[PDB]
Amino acid sequence: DYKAPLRDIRFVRDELLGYEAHYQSLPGAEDATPDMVNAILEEGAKFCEQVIAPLNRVGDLEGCTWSADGVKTPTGFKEAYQQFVEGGWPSLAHDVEHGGQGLPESLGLAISEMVGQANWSWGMYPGLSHGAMNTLHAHGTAEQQATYLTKLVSGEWTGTMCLTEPHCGTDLGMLRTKAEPQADGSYKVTGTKIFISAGEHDMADNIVHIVLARLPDAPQGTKGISLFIVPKFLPNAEGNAGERNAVSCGSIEHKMGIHGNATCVMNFDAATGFLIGPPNKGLNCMFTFMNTARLGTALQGLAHAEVGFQGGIAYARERLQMRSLTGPKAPEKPADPIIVHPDVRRMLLTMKAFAEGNRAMLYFAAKQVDIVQRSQDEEQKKAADSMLAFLTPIAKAFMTEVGFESANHGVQIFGGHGFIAEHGMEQNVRDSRISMLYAGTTGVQALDLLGRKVLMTQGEALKGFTKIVHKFCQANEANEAVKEFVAPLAQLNKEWGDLTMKVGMAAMKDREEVGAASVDYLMYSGYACLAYFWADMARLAAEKLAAGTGEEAFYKAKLQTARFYFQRILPRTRAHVAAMLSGANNLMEMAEEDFALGY
């Protein structure tokens, strides 16, 4: 019943963002031809629709089962992973040198989009493995790549990111897991990691943990953390799973959602590990993995909006309840389908505006990934790296926050039926809630965007995007079809720079102003990004209608969604502006001991 949104994915990639010319321009991509790409997307869609989407409810109902022996995944999960590996999917967007198919990361990301929608909990197993692959590719030695990266690329082994300890998630500088150097050049790793997604499971031949730990007499805090490869089974002479390493799962968590993804307490009992990247540069190297996880979680945010929408539109066309305010629209039936109600249309259009808008932002970001990986033009590469660094926190926090809202609109359309397990809409909400907590909380994303990406680059990262918006407004300010979008967009674009300058000035007078403005500044930024993408989709829709498309309704719907976004969602920016400019004192003046005097 999940259906992949292939027509919209093709609209965004090929029509909006010129993917054919993009792939034509990039080393290694010249063979990623439209017919090959469309066949790969279609095969991806079928796997998602036929194999893993039917396992989504099973994953939530059964969850994972711990024994000291290991962790059992839900019925069908491991069989589906066997089919995924047999179909070659893990190798799709990885280097030919390491057993990969060599296709662009942005094509892999489209498969990931559909996987995350069909079964997010299932998709975490291969998804975390992609982060581990990216880390080994960027920082691994030749031998670490020959041993571990080839096995991850085939899908035979999976990978995990091991950061969190009981006392620290955001504050990695406090981690205490220790790496004791051995004469043989290896390390013995001792410590307890918690909330390790896919830490233990029954789906693969080995698990490759990528682990943050401290060398003896390393500096205090983040300047003292190093990165280690700690496999569940140590490689044998033939490079296959060998001696059991001293890594074991103590327990799995009982959670609100993503039950199908084992959330593991992992005990490292002087486990053998291998240093990856330079000593004391573990944070820098682990950021390869963390940035993969942030873009992947943004895709999770998109997934919850998409699933919300799919459920909501089906129910709104089928469920009859009350009558239209302008007279019975189905007078032959006992009641009208509830899509006749304006408030139901508001909730449908909200989910649609966020799913379709975020899809545009995601594939825009995916083009930057391809440029950084493949371009020979140092200037093009620098610009793409700056744009990706800017969009990563916006995509993660904004898409997750509005994806949870969208999941909740999906429930709301079902009325009381939305609270019932059988329909899947409440699971979509429960699975969505972790998306704003893991991979860097919304607040951490917001500090990254405003502190590190915007204020610490003198706004150069922001200027990259506002230049695009400015050029779009200059080009479209007298275009009759979209001049209604350009006027507010140009006002917003000017305001975005002015706000940034006002927030920066406040931060110079009081550093608390960075945290005080951060989440409003990020949400404002995401709304502004989608104003640009909606205005551009409206521009493209009007062009296609003028050209005499045979898909008139598809493009007319884009113009309706764009107008709904600008008139009913974008005005949320007015509240983020007022809040962010209101100043840190209204947050910081209350004494800690005075917050709870009503008892």
Place this chain on the structure above:
Amino acid sequence: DYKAPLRDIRFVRDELLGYEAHYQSLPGAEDATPDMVNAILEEGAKFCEQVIAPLNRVGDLEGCTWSADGVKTPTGFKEAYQQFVEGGWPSLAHDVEHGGQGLPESLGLAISEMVGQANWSWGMYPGLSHGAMNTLHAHGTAEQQATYLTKLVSGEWTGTMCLTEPHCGTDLGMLRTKAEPQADGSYKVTGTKIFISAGEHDMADNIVHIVLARLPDAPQGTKGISLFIVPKFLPNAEGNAGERNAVSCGSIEHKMGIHGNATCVMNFDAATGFLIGPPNKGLNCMFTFMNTARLGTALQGLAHAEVGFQGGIAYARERLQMRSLTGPKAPEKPADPIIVHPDVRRMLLTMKAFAEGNRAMLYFAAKQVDIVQRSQDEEQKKAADSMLAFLTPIAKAFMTEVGFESANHGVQIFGGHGFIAEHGMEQNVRDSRISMLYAGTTGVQALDLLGRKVLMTQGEALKGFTKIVHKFCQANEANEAVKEFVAPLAQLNKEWGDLTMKVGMAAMKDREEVGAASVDYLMYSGYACLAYFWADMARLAAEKLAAGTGEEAFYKAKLQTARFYFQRILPRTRAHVAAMLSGANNLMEMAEEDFALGY
């Protein structure tokens, strides 16, 4: 670990809303003296803290267990209900004539506030029974009151509201459950009701169902529905539970939350029932029950904000993570408590502003209930009835919507730990989600407020409240302590009438405009109500500080919370204004068949 917010309840009731003079002015209340009332609140708080709050997690973990025989409640629920009945709580705010203690409904509501916070699922059992009591009091014959109302007032029997069928929740005019008249003046009731809260359980001696059904050859729709008393056990000659009636629970639902409250499919197999109220006036009579449920669900919204806050403040003071932007505040510790972070303070102050603000609105509404029930002044009674009709949909939808937001802020403060079952914060979110769906969805509340309460009274219901706000602004516009609140409040108060006039004009041109504006109009109205209550609490805090209170910190915190509300939450009104004035066409123009063309 739940603590009743007794100091704040006393602040709102006695200091803000003059409850002592209120009770002094009302027939029957003159004995509800401050010392008696405070002892009752304290005993209420202890029951909640000691007996039912420790059962909240048990209720969620075990849920209810169906057998054809009946429905088992979670461990301890029925024992706690035995203690509640032995303590006399069910009879507290009911008529002496029917075995009641005769205390004001608004004092009962304070017990209900603490019950809903300690264990909402448990509280539903006595809470629905109060709705059944109110219905029997208003519409029952002497004999129906002697038989059923006395047993509900003692707590020996519980009560339910049976409306919903598989094909209809909001559209009661489509219900098909039939009542066949018998020669003995009784009716045989045949039909399946779904989502019957407390439909079957093991906690009481009988269950009194209040059931909507259709007489043979009644008019189409709501003009054809009648109300019936259908007990699980028919009364014997001594009025005690007698012959088993043909009422049985076919199944219970599997839901996202409120697991401790049995959500029952109830089969009426030509069950014996008794007409209550006039034939064909079932909707009018059932509204007594439905309005009790709407105010009770508003109290649920308050409960989720309160529990969110209690969990969040405890964690924010205890959890150490990262350091203040203005330098380590706890340099002796490995990290600062996370309350040093502005973004954590924003989430704490949001929950506090909604809990404390909604508490003020709730007890303001509770005074109207007391005036309608007890006043001999017809003019005072009319004004109170109008004010209660206006506030009921605002309280239900606004307090539930912002209570769910507040529950989610509670989770967010815990980071990844917030998703884990052991901490209770995720249960608070899951239990909160039903609050916007049952007792009339947010959208139904919004149509009731804008269509029935405001536009169909020519705004007289709104004018009742905006007159209070106007007089407050005239009184406080030069009061140095709160003039900063009055200026924006007076602008908002003028805007509230202007918006109402603009929305009414649009509705006259196109009736779709009522649904299109409805939810934004309700949320705007709730924010405006809390602007008034926060400005008034700030006024009262400044008065207490000028008087030389020994509780300086309590009142200083009220002023901080009020300023946080005005500067960071109230600007949400700017987005509701823009959206509501944007017009129905941006919702209604998209064709039904064009919403999902991206597949």
